[PDB]
Design an enzyme around this catalytic site. Structure first.
Site, short mmCIF file in Angstrom:
data_model
loop_
_atom_site.label_atom_id
_atom_site.label_comp_id
_atom_site.label_asym_id
_atom_site.label_seq_id
_atom_site.Cartn_x
_atom_site.Cartn_y
_atom_site.Cartn_z
N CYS A 18 5.93 55.94 -15.17
CA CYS A 18 5.99 57.12 -14.30
C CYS A 18 5.46 58.37 -15.01
CB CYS A 18 7.43 57.40 -13.84
SG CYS A 18 7.82 56.91 -12.13
N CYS A 20 5.49 62.38 -15.45
CA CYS A 20 6.66 63.28 -15.47
C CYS A 20 7.97 62.55 -15.80
CB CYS A 20 6.85 64.02 -14.13
SG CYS A 20 5.34 64.68 -13.40
N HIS A 26 16.28 67.91 -14.12
CA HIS A 26 17.49 67.14 -13.80
C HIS A 26 17.37 65.64 -14.12
CE1 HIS A 26 21.14 69.00 -12.42
NE2 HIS A 26 20.53 69.81 -11.56
N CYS A 102 11.02 57.75 -7.21
CA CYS A 102 9.94 58.68 -7.56
C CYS A 102 8.59 58.36 -6.91
CB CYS A 102 9.79 58.70 -9.08
SG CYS A 102 9.78 57.04 -9.78
N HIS A 154 15.91 40.64 -35.21
CA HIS A 154 16.97 39.64 -35.06
C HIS A 154 16.43 38.28 -34.63
CE1 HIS A 154 19.92 42.84 -35.31
NE2 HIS A 154 19.59 43.36 -34.14
#
Ligand SMILES: O=C(c1ccc(C(O)(O)C(F)(F)F)s1)N1CCn2c(-c3ccccc3)cnc2C1
Ligand SMILES: [K+]
Ligand SMILES: [K+]
Ligand SMILES: [Zn+2]
Ligand SMILES: [Zn+2]
Length: 402
Positions: A18, A20, A26, A102, A154
Site C-alpha cells: 500500500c 501511504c 491515524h 484502503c 531458526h
C-alpha cells in the site's frame, strides 16, 4: 557513488503493498519491511545506498543448508503439482486475494495461502540476501543491509520453525564457501533469540565463527537452545560462541550489558579469528518495546548503530546485515536507520552519558564470565587476563590508559 552501502528489498516478499502505508494521522497496518524501507527513504539513506535487485534462491542454493525434501515442499509453488486447471485454477486465485479498506488488494492473511506465501517469500528473501552478500564479498559494494522477511535463523536442515522456512544467512555463507572459497566467515546473530539453525549449519565447521547474543535464562526462553556449553564438534570445537544471557529480567539487559558483551567477548574473539567476511543475523527484538515473552530487553536503537560500527572494524568492513526478528515498528525502523547510517559512515549520534557511565548488571557480568571461562580454552585473547566485564565503557577506557 557505487562503491557504497547496498540495500536489498522486494515488494513480492510482502502480503500487501500500500502507498501511504507508513501513515501519519491515524491508521496502523502495513508490515515490518515496508515500514523499514519507507524510513530508509524519508531519511534519504536509500538515496546514498545502491539499491540491488533480488531474486528467488534456486532450489540447489537452498539445499546448501536444507534437505531436498524440505526444499521441494516449502520452496516450490504448490499449484504446479495439481495439473493445470481453469475453473479450479481461477477459484484458488479468488481465495488468495482480498480487497482491503484502503482500496488496495493483498494476500488474504485469514486463509491457508498465508503460510504458503510466507514459504515463497522465504525463498525470495534467501536469494535477496545471497545477491547482496556476493556483491559485498566481491567488492562491487562496500556494505549491505538486507530488508528481508520472513526471518531465517531458526530454520533447521529439515525443519521450519519460529516463522522461518529457510536460513538465508546460512545459505549465503555456504555459497561464499563453495563459490568463492572464502576461508573465514564470521556470523554474528544479535536477534534476542538463539539462532539454532545457523549453529547447526556450521557446528562442526571451524571455517565459520558463529556468535549469538541471546536471552537464554538457563533454557527457558524460545527456542530453548544456545547454552554457553555449546562450543562446536569435531574440527569446529571452539568456533561456536553462545553469548547466552541468564538471570531473567532482574534487571532487563540493556545497552550497557550488550556493549560490555562486545568489549569482552565478541570483539576480542572475532578480532582474533580475523574473518574475511562478516554476516549479521540482525534481529531487533532486543530493543525496548518488546515486552517480556517476545523480548524483555531494552536496548536503544542507536546502540545497534554502535554495534554495527564495531563489526565494521573487521573483515576490512565487508559486512552484510540481514533482518531477522523485531516487531515494534518504531523500534525496528529506528534500529534499521541506525544500522544503515553506520554502514554509510555517517557520524553516529553519541550514546547518552547515562549509558557510557553505566556498569553492566550482575547477571550480565556473570553471563559474560561463564562464556569467557568456557571459551578461554579455545581463544588466546581470554587466556591472558582477568575479567573487566563489570566496568562501564568509560571505566574500561579510563583503565586501559596507564
Ligand atoms: O518466541 C517466539 C519467536 C519465534 C520467532 C522469533 C524471532 O526470532 O523474532 C524471529 F524468528 F521472528 F526472528 S521469536 N515464539 C514464542 C512465542 N510464540 C507464540 C506465543 C503464543 C502464545 C503466547 C505467547 C507467544 C506464538 N508463536 C511463538 C513463537
Ligand atoms: K541471537
Ligand atoms: K562453527
Ligand atoms: Zn493498505
Ligand atoms: Zn527473535
Amino acid at each position: 557513488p557505487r562503491f557504497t552501502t547496498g540495500l536489498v528489498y522486494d515488494t513480492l516478499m510482502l502480503k500487501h503493498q500500500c502507498t501511504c502505508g507508513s501513515s501519519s494521522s491515524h491508521p496502523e497496518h502495513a508490515g515490518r519491511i515496508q515500514s523499514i524501507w519507507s524510513r530508509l527513504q524519508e531519511t534519504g539513506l536509500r538515496g546514498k545506498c545502491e539499491c540491488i535487485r533480488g531474486r528467488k534462491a534456486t532450489l540447489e542454493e537452498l539445499q546448501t543448508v536444507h534437505s531436498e525434501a524440505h526444499t521441494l515442499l516449502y520452496g516450490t509453488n504448490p499449484l504446479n503439482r495439481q495439473k493445470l486447471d481453469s475453473k479450479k485454477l481461477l477459484g484458488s486465485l479468488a481465495s488468495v486475494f482480498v480487497r482491503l479498506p484502503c482500496g488496495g488488494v493483498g494476500v488474504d492473511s485469514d486463509t491457508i495461502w498465508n503460510e504458503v506465501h510466507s514459504a515463497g517469500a522465504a525463498r525470495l528473501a534467501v536469494g535477496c540476501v545471497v545477491e547482496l552478500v556476493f556483491k559485498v564479498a566481491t567488492g562491487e559494494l562496500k556494505n549491505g543491509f538486507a530488508v528481508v522477511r520472513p526471518p531465517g535463523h531458526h530454520a533447521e536442515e529439515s525443519t521450519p520453525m519460529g516463522f522461518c522456512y529457510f536460513n538465508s544467512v546460512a545459505v549465503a555463507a555456504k555459497l561464499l564457501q563453495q563459490r568463492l572459497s572464502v576461508s573465514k566467515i564470521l556470523i554474528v546473530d544479535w536477534d534476542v533469540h538463539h539462532g539454532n539453525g545457523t549453529q547447526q549449519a556450521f557446528y562442526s565447521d571451524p571455517s565459520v565463527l558463529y556468535m549469538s547474543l541471546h536471552r537464554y535464562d538457563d533454557g527457558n526462553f524460545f527456542p530453548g537452545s544456545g547454552a554457553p556449553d555449546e562450543v562446536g564438534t569435531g574440527p569446529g570445537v571452539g568456533f561456536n560462541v553462545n553469548m547466552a544471557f541468564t538471570g531473567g529480567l532482574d534487571p532487563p539487559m540493556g545497552d550497557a550489558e550488550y556493549l560490555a558483551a562486545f568489549r569482552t567477548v565478541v570483539m576480542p574473539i572475532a578480532s582474533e579469528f580475523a574473518p574475511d567476511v562478516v554476516l549479521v543475523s540482525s534481529g531487533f527484538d532486543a530493543v525496548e518495546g518488546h515486552p517480556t515473552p517476545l523480548g524483555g530487553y531494552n536496548l536503544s536503537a542507536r546502540c545497534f548503530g554502535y554495534l554495527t560500527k564495531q563489526l565494521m572494524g573487521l573483515a576490512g568492513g565487508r559486512i552484510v546485515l540481514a533482518l531477522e526478528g523485531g516487531h515494534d515498528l518504531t523500534a525496528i525502523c529506528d534500529a534499521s536507520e541506525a544500522c544503515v547510517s553506520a554502514l554509510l559512515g555517517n557520524e553516529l549520534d553519541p550514546l547518552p552519558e547515562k549509558v557510557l557511565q553505566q556498569r553492566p548488571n550482575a547477571n550480565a557480568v556473570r553471563s559474560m564470565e561463564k562464556v569467557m571461562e568456557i571459551h578461554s580454552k579455545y581463544w588466546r585473547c581470554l587466556q591472558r587476563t582477568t575479567s573487566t566485564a563489570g566496568r562501564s565503557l568509560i571505566e574500561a577506557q579510563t583503565c586501559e590508559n596507564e
